Each structure stands twice: as structure tokens, then as C-alpha cells.
Structure 1
Amino acid sequence: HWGYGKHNGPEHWHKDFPIAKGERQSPVDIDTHTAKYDPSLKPLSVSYDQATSLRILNNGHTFNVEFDDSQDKAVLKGGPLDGTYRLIQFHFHWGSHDGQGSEHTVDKKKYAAELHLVHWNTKYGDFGKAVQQPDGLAVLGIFLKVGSANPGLQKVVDVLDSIKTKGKSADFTNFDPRGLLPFSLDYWTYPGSLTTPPLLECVTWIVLKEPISVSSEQVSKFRKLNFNGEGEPEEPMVDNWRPTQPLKNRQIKASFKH
């Protein structure tokens, strides 16, 4: 099936997922000089105080922290969004080396990793209905810049040893995802897609300008995960990122003035 290797990686996803070459694919490069301020955007509201984390798991592509999304315990509203978007999971993308790893780029520059907090529009009742709609999902993208250790990531790093191979999971309760947000919520937004197959064009992307920190040591712990399942051959989980795709007939809008 699909992955990030030379034969099954992003350059070949279009064979089985022809939307890979569609009008609204992600990620993209963000040109800070040409992304224009949009005064119609409303203030972005992140409400995570009651978020309920459940489990952390290795799905053979990344690791996901899963949240209870049966109620409005953790929601995103405002900004470019109409309505209420519920948090279902977050996950990361990272590189084999600190100089690469992010999916979005900023003025063609890559960060060491990128965090995605995935939310779905409650007017569709269920995540599975939402992903079929152009306004179905909102993903909050946060860059990780190597520097000082990040205390808000350490609880994640501390459990990765328990989920080294595909299919493993662990209890992961009482994690506060507010600890992964920067202090400024200044952002860029554009309409796009999931960055993994099935690459559905159902996402309102909200990419924060301010990165969060991660130590070189913390990101090296991401790289100790494996793509493979136990009893299968070893494939270190590195470089699980899709390269940037053409902007085509879209506009990237800024929440803030240059």
C-alpha cells in the first residue's frame, strides 16, 4: 500500500489516488510577501480547556494522539471557519535530519517538523461524513523549530517507546493540547487537502506563523519509531512528509498585517 519510500511514496500516490494532481492539494509553499491580510477573517478561537485525550498510536505512517470527539470538548471556531470544528486527533511529520521535516514551507524554508491538529465540522454529525465535504475539516498546522526543549511535548516523547511499531497503541489520558500552541495565533489560511492518501480536498488549512520549539533530542525520539509492524523488517519512521504542491487557483490569506 502507500508510504513514503522510493516506490510507494508521494511521487507515486497519484496512480491509485488521482486527486493527488487535483486543484486543491496540500501542503503548499507560503510566500509571506504575497499572502495578503484579509480583514473579513474573524478572531480565531481555540477552546481546548476540556479536551479529553484517550490513546496514542502508531499507524505505520505517523503517530496519532486520539481525542474523545463525541462532544464539544475541544473545538476550533472563528478565523475563516463557519461553525464549530471538533478536535479528533493530532499527529506530526518530521525528517531524517533537522533541516527538513515540515510539510508546509515558508518562503521555501523547511522546519524540522510540523504538527497537525485535525478537526471536523459538527454540522455533518460524524467525521466520516465531514471528510466528504469541501468544508468538512479544519487542520491547524504548527511548525517545530529546533532549539530549547519543549515541556509541552515531553509527555508525548516519554510514551513513544511503548508504540515503536505499526499497530501498537497506549493509554494516553489527561494530555492538554494547549501546551502545543504558540502564544501568538497569527496565521495563514487556504483551502486544501489531506496530505496523505486519500488526499481528499476537504480541509481549511490554518497554518500558524509562530513556531513552537523542540530540542534536537526530542525530535530524535520521533525517529526511533518504525513504519513496520513487529515481526516485519525494520523501516525507521523518518521523512513522513509530502513535498509542496502547486498553489493553482487559490489564495493564501493572512490573519495579520505585514
Structure 2
Amino acid sequence: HWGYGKHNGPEHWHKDFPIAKGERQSPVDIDTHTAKYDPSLKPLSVSYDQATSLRILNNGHAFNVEFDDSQDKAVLKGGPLDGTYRLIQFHFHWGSLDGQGSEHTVDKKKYAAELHLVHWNTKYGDFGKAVQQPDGLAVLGIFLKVGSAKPGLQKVVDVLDSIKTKGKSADFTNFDPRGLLPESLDYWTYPGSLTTPPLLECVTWIVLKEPISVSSEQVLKFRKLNFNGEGEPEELMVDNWRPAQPLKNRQIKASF
């Protein structure tokens, strides 16, 4: 089954998921000089004050912090979006070394990791129905660069010992996502897909311009995780990111 190694990595995915070669695949390189400023793009409205985190899970390719989405508790609206999208989970993609890790790149520059906050469109009623629609999901992507510690990331970093291997999970309540946001909410946006199998083309990507800083030791603990399940040969969870895909005539719009 798919992964990120030599034999099952991004370049092999088309064999089982033919949409890998589709028309609106993500991630893409964001060229700042070709992105078009769009004056009608509204400001983002992130309402995460009533968020309820539940669990953190190692799923064999990243770790997910999951949220209670049975009511409009943590939602995203405004921006390029029509309607309310609920936060269901967030995860990261990171590298083995600080100069690679992000999925989206800006003028070919790669950051150390990328945070994806995944939201689904409430008019479709549940997550499974939202992935059957071209505007079913909105993912908020935030870049991470090594520098000063991000205090709001530390609670996540400390629980990672408990979910070292594939399939382990831990209770993770009362985590507040607002501590992972940069100061500015300027963004680029384009229509894309999930960046892992099943690679469904249902996503409106909102990639924030401003990165958050994390310390070198915060990023180092991400790299101690395992793709493997307990009692198998250890394979460090590093480089779980997909190379950029062809933009193919889509336009990237900027809110600034």
C-alpha cells in the first residue's frame, strides 16, 4: 500500500489512484509574480474559540489531531468560500532536514513542515458526502520554519511519545488551534486535491502567506515518529510530503 518510500512513494501512486495525473492536483509551487491579486476576495473568518479536540492518532503517514464536528464549533468561512466549513482534523507534513518538508513551495522555496487544517462543507451534511463534491473541502495550509519556539505547539509535541507507531492514539482534549495561527491572515488560494491517496479533487486550498516559527527541537520530535506499527522494523516518519504537481491552467489568486 502507498507510502513515501522508494517502492511505494508519490511517483508510484498513479497505478492505484489514476487521478494522480489529473487536472487539479496539489501541491503546486506558488509563483508570487504570476499569482493574481484579486480585490473581490473577502477576508478569512476563522472562528475556533468553541473548538473541541478529542484525539491524536498516528495513522502510518502523519499524526492527526481530530475534532468534534457534529455541530458548528470550529468553522472557517469568508475568503474564497461560499458557506461554512467545519474543522474535522489537522496534521503536518515534515522533512528529514530543515530545508525540505512543506508540500506547497513559494518561488520554489521549501519550508521545514506544513500544517493542514482540514474542513468540510456543511451543506453536504457529512464528510463522506463532501468528498463527492468539487467544493466539498477547504484546507488551510500554514508553513513552518525553524526559529523561535511556538508555545502553542508544545502540547502536541509532548504527547508524541504516546503515539510513536502506526495505529496508536491518545486522548487529546481542550487543545486550542488558535495557538498555531500566524499574525496575518493574508493568503493565496487555488482549486486542488488531497495530497495523499485517494487524491480526490475536492479541495479549495487556502495557503497563508506568513509562516509560523517552531524551534529546532520542536521539529526534531516529529522526526522520532514511526511509519511502522509496533514490533515491526523501525522506519522513521520523515519526508511524508508530495512533490509539487503541474498547475495546468489553474490560476492562483492572492488576497494581497
1:198 shift after superposition: 0.3
Number of corresponding residues: 256
1:232 shift after superposition: 1.3
1:159 shift after superposition: 0.2
1:132 shift after superposition: 1.1
1:200 shift after superposition: 0.2
1:40 shift after superposition: 1.5
Distance 2:91 2:131 in 1: 17
1:249 shift after superposition: 1.7
Distance 1:111 1:104 in 2: 9
1:186 shift after superposition: 0.2
Q: Which residue of 2 aligns with 1:114?
A: 114
1:151 shift after superposition: 0.4
Distance 2:215 2:132 in 1: 37
TM-score (norm. length: structure 2): 0.99
Q: Deviations over 1:127-185 (max 9, x none)?
A: 00001110000000000010001101000000000000000000001000010000100
1:231 shift after superposition: 1.5
TM-score (norm. length: structure 1): 0.99
1:233 shift after superposition: 1.3
Q: Which residue of 1 aligns with 2:228?
A: 228
Distance 1:218 1:120 in 2: 29
Q: Deviations over 1:198-239 (max 9, x none)?
A: 000000000000000111111010000000000211110000
Distance 2:63 2:80 in 1: 28
1:65 shift after superposition: 0.2
Q: C-alpha root-mean-square deviation of aligned residues, in Å? A: 0.4
Could you say what secondary structure the match of 2:243 adopts? coil
Q: Deviations over 1:37-65 (max 9, x none)?
A: 11121121000000000000000000000
1:30 shift after superposition: 0.3
Q: Deviations over 1:83-142 (max 9, x none)?
A: 000000000000000010000000000000000000000000000000111000000000
Distance 1:249 1:54 in 2: 40
Q: Which residue of 2 aligns with 1:164?
A: 164
Distance 2:21 2:99 in 1: 27
Structure 1 segments, 4+ long, off by >3 Å, are none
Q: Deviations over 1:6-37 (max 9, x none)?
A: 01000000000010000000000000111111
Distance 2:255 2:71 in 1: 28
Distance 1:40 1:228 in 2: 46
Distance 2:75 2:177 in 1: 11
Which consecutive residues of structure 1, in runs of 5 or more, have no partner in the other structure?
none
Distance 2:26 2:157 in 1: 27
